[PDB]
Amino acid sequence: SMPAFTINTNIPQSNVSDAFLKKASSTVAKALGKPESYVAIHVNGGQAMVFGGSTDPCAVCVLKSIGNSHSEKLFKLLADELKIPKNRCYIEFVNIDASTMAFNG
Amino acid sequence: GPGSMPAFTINTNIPQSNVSDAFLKKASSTVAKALGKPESYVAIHVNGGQAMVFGGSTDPCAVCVLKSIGNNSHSEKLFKLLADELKIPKNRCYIEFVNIDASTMAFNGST
Amino acid sequence: SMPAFTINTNIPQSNVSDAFLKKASSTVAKALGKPESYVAIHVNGGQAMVFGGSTDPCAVCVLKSIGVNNSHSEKLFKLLADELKIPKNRCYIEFVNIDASTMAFNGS
Ligand code: NA
C-alpha cells in the first residue's frame, strides 16, 4: 500500500518545484512514520477552483492511507511553498479500511 | 482548524480554456443552493483538459463527484449546470453523490 | 453506476493516445464484466508527482466500482507499462469497491 498526498490548487503549476515535491514526500513519510519508498505525492496545479465562494489562491488536499506533529507541518508547507493563505489550505486526512482493530489475548 | 467542506469535482475533457470565471461563480452558487449551505462552506474543482473515455467514446463528457462528510432536484440542477454552461450533453454527464462517515445516526430517548 | 479507471501520471498528456484510451476502456470493461457503455477512463497527465522519493515517470491509479482482480491487475499493469512506457515498478493501482461490504441471502 502507498499513502498518497494529493494537492489540488489554482496556483500555476510552474510554481510547483521538484524541491517542493521532495520536501512534501519527506514530510508525508515522516508524518505517517513510513518509508519514503512507499509514499506518493501528486500536485495538480493550475486548476479552476472555487474555495468558499472565491477563486483566490487555494489548495484542497487529501492525505489517503490504508489503516499530528507533521500534519501542521503539511499545512505550513502548503502555505509557505505555494504562497497560499493558510485559511485557504484544506486537507482531508482519510484512513481507508481502518474501522476495526482486533486483539487476542 | 477542524471543519468539513462539501466539494463538487468535475472531470471533463473539454479544454480548461473553456472554463470561465462566470461558470465557476455559477457552479459555486448552484452547489451551495442545492445543498442549502452558504457558499463559504463549498469547494468547486473543475479538472478540465482531461483525456477521457465515456461509454467507449472520447466525445465531450463529464464525470463528477459531490462529496460531503456527514438528492434528486439537486442532481437535475447540477446536470442543468453542466449541459447549459459547459455544453456537455446530459447523456454524457455522470454524477456520484458520496456521503462519507454517515452510516450511523444515534438517538437517546432524552432527545 | 459507472465503473471508473483513473490514472494520475507525470508523463505529458501528449503521450496519452486515443488508441491507449480505447484499449484501456476495453480492458476495464472485460475485467469487470460490464458493458463498455458504462465504463469511464480518466487519464490526468502532466502532473507534478513524486513516487517513492523519485520524480521519474510513474502512475498512481484507482479502479473504482460500486457493488478476480489479480489476473486483470496484471493486464492493467502491462497496459500501463507497454502503452504509456512507465516501468511496472512505478505503477500503483488501487481496486476500490464502494458500498460492497454486505451480501444478504435467504435460504430459498
Ligand atoms: Na490544524
Author numbering:
A (entry chain C): 0 to 66, 74 to 111
B (entry chain A): -3 to 66, 73 to 113
C (entry chain B): 0 to 66, 72 to 112
Please give me the paper's original passages concerning this structure:
O. volvulus and other parasitic nematodes co-evolved with their hosts and are experts at surviving in hostile microenvironments, where they feed on host blood and release molecules such as macrophage migration inhibitory factor (MIF) homologs to evade or suppress host immune responses for several years without killing the host. O. volvulus and many parasitic nematodes secrete MIF homologs to facilitate evasion of the host’s immune system. Parasite MIFs have tautomerase activity and catalyze the keto–enol isomerization of aromatic substrates such as hydroxyphenyl­pyruvate and l-dopachrome methyl ester. OvMIF-1 is a possible drug target.
